[PDB]
């Protein structure tokens, strides 16, 4: 009780710095149909290819970054098989690369933060990929040269919503421990889900057109040091809820051939139509009355999803413009994406001369969604911009 | 403003463990006759000098009993499961995705029944397993089978090894402490379907995991600010921390491949664990000014007989201190992250039956210990609670 009051922080969790990274291989969406069909030896599937081209154009993605190259596909051709065993080839890659790519985003965040690594007390790290013991948390802590006493937590194989969920965890770690400085990191590399095309599974090609790679990192803490730590946002509330009877709406299976993902065509409608209950619970206490009263850091998912959310909530096009930019310029980087959107929102706020880091509004929602259906709402307070 | 609201949101006291339930699969595997069954069913009867090496292993493990989801009939339906290093992942995944959540349901139901409050009052779920990876997760499946509210904040932690049972306490501590009214369902479930396989002579390590490892689940409910007269704390979480021993990633670990999980270890793993406890125990027990290691009680993840022996021998603990770890490891084997919950359950049960003054065998402070790959040391400090008889 007396111990309890002393060992705990006083104020809200704060996002103090944001870093992002991608692999160095640019893949342009306009020539991706050509690369994909040539290197998976599928040039005799011209009708499927032409269909692939149309799908690519409609994804509205311009570029993605992938760790995978033609070199890697020639050296381990089982990565190309659509349903033969290829798990070992995939594991060899992700167990190594998931921590390396994470490091890039972590370093950049830690640099903006401007404090000694020795002052990090916790690391919370998520990825779909790179399962091994010890795990990717261990490897990442080690690459960065974190102190050995750092509390590490790895969250494997949760999908797109995990980015937001990490904020939910970081909130409690930062707030309940005086002095805690949490390194939060999302990294995804599509090597476990990449595969050649199948003429009887045209829809599943949506994951070959839509997913890219990337890592996002932040430093979260309560009680910012005056004149040394400048908060970008305050986490005011963070929560999750599950949509009844929507397990079949989106998800996947980890099998001998790697990850396969599935979705229903109505997934945009399903997400859009079930957001209102969540956001109500999160924002009514603040007395906001219009969805356009708050700023939005949305995980895109895909263009249809952004669309259906924009239509259902009646959002002016500025609200999700940041989700759209990031998605068009990088694709869906699963759990990482929302950090890119975050980063893009606070930079634009500064460049466009806005009063806050949330585009001039006080309150925001950071939104993640994934298999469940799972909705992660994280309520942000913006911080003043002094131009 | 948000300093104001901050005060309204947060809890007041320490996180407390409020209930503990445990469960196993229905299938009894006696260790005296396990070599028989394990050679019969893996079609390895036409080998005989290995058969005697293994009976000798099973004898030295000190395990009497384990419970496995696996049966002979399942191995008949899915022969690849008995293969040494052939691809078997699909079969293994078919079972774990389905069964991990079902076994965790049982432990959780038990905890919730001891607790005796409605499921609607559960606000978080933290759930770990080596196994059962699907999207949505095992966490989603358990939530649904239990009928938890849709608004429950879930967290699944896959594929961390044995120390994860203790690490969850470290997380639930912060969830319970930072939220007024938070009630956190903490569950651990392990089923060795992914690791079970037949023998190879050029491999001793694998052989140990066919002998030492068992199935089971544990569940506790964690909350701060207990409702007076309704919630009865068994322990208070005072502190929880993690430490990694330098240059020891090779001491114990594992790999997830198309043949399932493979686990390695160095023979000196007992020495390694015991020689590196002092640092953790200092940062943990010095604030309380503890004189002798024998002054606190111990809820230690057993791991194996040698490990228990190394710890007792290094900290000069009297036999009573780890006798609960020994009992669980003897009657259940090593259930990875779940084991420590069976150990906690044992200590508090005996404490009651034997007439003790507290839930920690009569003592005030105690340490709960997890270890696994890293090397990772999980240290949770427990304050026991009075036993009114």
Curated annotation (Swiss-Prot), chain A:
According to UniProt, the name of this protein is: Curcumin synthase 1
Its biological purpose is as follows: Catalyzes the synthesis of curcumin by condensing feruloyl-CoA with a diketide-CoA in the curcuminoid biosynthesis.
* Pfam families the UniProt entry points to: Chal_sti_synt_C, Chal_sti_synt_N
Q: Which organism is it from?
A: Curcuma longa
Q: How does it assemble?
A: Homodimer.
Q: Which tissues is this chain's protein expressed in?
A: Expressed in both the leaf and rhizome, with higher expression in the rhizome.
Its UniProt pathway annotation is:
Secondary metabolite biosynthesis; flavonoid biosynthesis
Q: Which family does it belong to?
A: Belongs to the thiolase-like superfamily. Chalcone/stilbene synthases family.
EC number from the UniProt entry: 2.3.1.217
How does activity behave across temperatures?
Optimum temperature is 50 degrees Celsius.
Active site positions, chain numbering? 160
For the keyword Transferase, the answer is: yes
UniProt GO molecular function: acyltransferase activity, transferring groups other than amino-acyl groups; curcumin synthase activity
